[PDB]
Amino acid sequence: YEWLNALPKAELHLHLEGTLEPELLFALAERNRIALPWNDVETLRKAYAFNNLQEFLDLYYAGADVLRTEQDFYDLTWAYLQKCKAQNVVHVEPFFDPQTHTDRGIPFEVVLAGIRAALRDGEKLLGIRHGLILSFLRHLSEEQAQKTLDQALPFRDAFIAVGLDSSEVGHPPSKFQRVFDRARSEGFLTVAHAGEEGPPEYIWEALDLLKVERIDHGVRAFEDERLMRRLIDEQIPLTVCPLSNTKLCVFDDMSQHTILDMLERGVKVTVNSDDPAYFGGYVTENFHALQQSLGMTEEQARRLAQNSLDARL
Ligand code: HPA
Ligand SMILES: [Zn+2]
Is the N end or the C end of the chain the one with fewer CB atoms within 10 Å? Predict the structure, then answer.
């Protein structure tokens, strides 16, 4: 663990909203004078049992209620950056879901201000390079995403890319082809969630329609040999999230996970925590799980860590 924790890493698949520790949620609710449904930290913490992606999302979005002021968004981001320092993550390219907040009345400028301020401290104080990624909510309409992109334009230099998260199944990448087209035209790089719960086809769509630079999750690509051969050949990065896949039942067990298999075949896989506050582990806890349940070696450890550095945008 300590050896794993000492490795220099880059986290390329992480939702800032998914770093909302139960404790923080309660503290922010207190500061905002919000009455929580949950009786105590422990009660919220045991609500963290998921049968699938959606059950997690429902709670995930619920917690986002406490995020209301700039200082809120700073605290959220700064807390995570401190974890990064602790676990020697030297570079971050995090997600956030502006719609989750803007649809709640919180000004776009307020959300960005808080996060940006934290990112600034992260680099000058902690020496952590950042690349903010704006993610669209895929269960919502492409029109709603277009309206979000319009908000983002004056801010565009604050984002290295646009992403796509939320309920995958039934909301294929193609649904957002237009806004992604416009995003790139406006100077955004692109990434996307594909093949978490969705089929290999969704991954092809991400690659060819949304023209992403990397696939987020992408584990279901294992079902498609033709796709696998492309991945290996094009060295397109995959931001794999071990604990997330386990907690969401993508794999019935960590021993079932295919990330090492992919690694040995030549796929540019990386290790990420995704939604750490919800899956009970940050990036180091993810590396560790691979070691305990898959007998991962230091050898493959150095390699995964390196890929994450290489796959920086
Ligand atoms: O990992 C994820 N998958 C889909 N939607 C999400 N919203 C936060 N994390 C995720
Ligand atoms: Zn994710």
Answer: N
Q: Is 193 in the pocket of ligand 1 (CB under 6 A)?
A: yes
d(CA 304, CA 271): 7
| Distance in Å, CA 165 to ligand 1 centroid | 5
* Residue 90 tokens, joined: 């030297």
Which stretches of 67-131 are DSSP H helices? Answer: 70-86, 98-102, 108-124
Q: Is 257 annotated as a binding residue?
A: no
Structure tokens at 118: 């934290």
- The experimental technique used to determine this model is X-ray
Question: Does residue 196 carry a catalytic annotation?
Answer: yes
Distance CA 67, CA 69 (A): 6
What are the structural domain ranges in the chain?
A: 1-313
Q: Which residue of the set 17, 93, 168, 196 is catalytic?
A: 196
Ligand 1 binding pocket includes 15 (Cβ within 6 Å): yes
Residue from 84, 6, 12 nearest 241 by CA: 12
Query: Tokens 């004056």 identify what position?
Result: 154
Q: Which CATH superfamily is domain 1-313 in?
A: Metal-dependent hydrolases (3.20.20.140)
